[PDB]
């Protein structure tokens, strides 16, 4: 339900994960500094807490508030319960990150302040909701 | 909107579609025989006639009629007026079609009476109703 | 051991190939326009009436002969009599042919004049020279 | 030219790389526990101390010495010094591991004693001896 690869401290590249969506809950892909620190998370809601097929970014140093909010249009959420294979690319630019979902742009997001790269670690995360479709992480990639 | 590919006739293998879906319309393929009979068509409706995300599979003999509809659950159509890239592949069995789209398997199809392969031709139709985004082909393959 | 993809006359976009190679014989591919015209020859020769691993591509008039020969560095055909998957790509462009093989680009070959696009046919052949692993067709794809 | 990915105690599925191969020099893969064995070397030797185009397979307590060497044939080198894209694949299973690469598998590994799995750790180390086209690295990948 929660796996991550630990890399050599990354400025460039990008990273993937692939993995089958659930009907419900929700899955974050986090990208971690070494000192902990949320330097983007993709939080994808397909049922959490009220909330139905609804995509959060932000980001966070250890131990602190999180940011304002980003709610960007576009991710594909299955309609009707249904479950897909999600496939997800974090590229990190010299400015920000981009994410892309099944090879189309969702958004470019600028670095938050004091918050920028190296990356060394990006996580997967699983929340259940009472899910009868739970969600599989199929793969989980660097990017050179 | 309209692009094909025909084939030796062929009695194995399968056959596959990518393409960027469109918000409103529908998209529909088609696999003839050589008389032009529509052995099957796997038609994915976005908005069409006052149904929105439905999926409908029949059989015809060219100029025939109809047979019954089969509608499976499961077909990635997106949310909230989205669209995405997806990913067809139309497999053929000893005894039917199989029917997989973006890695997951959707729906066995048996057959109908005096409508076996081979398949000659494979065809991406795509009918339009004030979309707002139209829908993208991007390739064809055929499997052996 | 031969197959094919019709399609309505193209003019820009792509082609593909999957195959298993052969350590002996070789694996040919053709871009026929409707007129017959063989537009492009692709003709990789593992093992084959005296030369071995050479890529030859040309052009040639539905019956006249062949022009200039052309024998391009960069091709991965394997050591040692070993065989292995292959994957090929031609590009359509304005003034020229892209070849790629692997991901990494072959031969720009700019178009063979009176013998431009459209291409309403690709074609794998492979003829053997009694090879002990024997080649295999995997895919054939046209790209919009 | 050395990046490696950390990964929990894995115990099955994968691990993938892709490189962009050299014209000289060596590209080792190590796959290390917790405690730092080198529980399997693939080792792709393409002009390494006077041995052309040789795959080592090995194993190794940490600080202890090496075993037996496996050499096995079919590994996709290219001719003549060209380079090309390579994808590799290791899998975890149950009684051993099993190499592939380009999605054709190359040989069985049955764990060598007190050297078993999980791996905790996969690296990619090229090694140049003078090459003139140097390896680049494409992705690492884990599989679940």
Chains 1, 2, 3, 4 share one sequence.
Do not use: H
């Amino acid at each position: 339900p929660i796996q991550s690869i630990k890399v050599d401290p990354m400025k460039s590249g990008g990273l993937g994960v692939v993995y089958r969506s659930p009907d419900k809950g929700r899955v974050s892909l986090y990208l971690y500094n070494d000192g902990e620190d949320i330097l983007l998370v993709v939080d994808a809601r397909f049922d959490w807490r009220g909330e139905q097929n609804v995509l959060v970014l932000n980001s966070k140093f250890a131990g602190g508030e999180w940011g304002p909010e980003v709610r960007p249009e576009g991710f594909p959420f299955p309609c009707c319960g249904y479950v897909t294979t999600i496939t997800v690319r974090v590229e990190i630019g010299a400015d920000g990150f981009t994410l892309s979902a099944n090879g189309i742009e969702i958004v470019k997001y600028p670095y938050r302040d004091g918050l920028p790269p190296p990356v060394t670690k990006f996580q997967y995360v699983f929340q259940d909701q009472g899910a009868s479709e739970t969600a599989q992480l199929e793969s989980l990639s660097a990017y050179y």
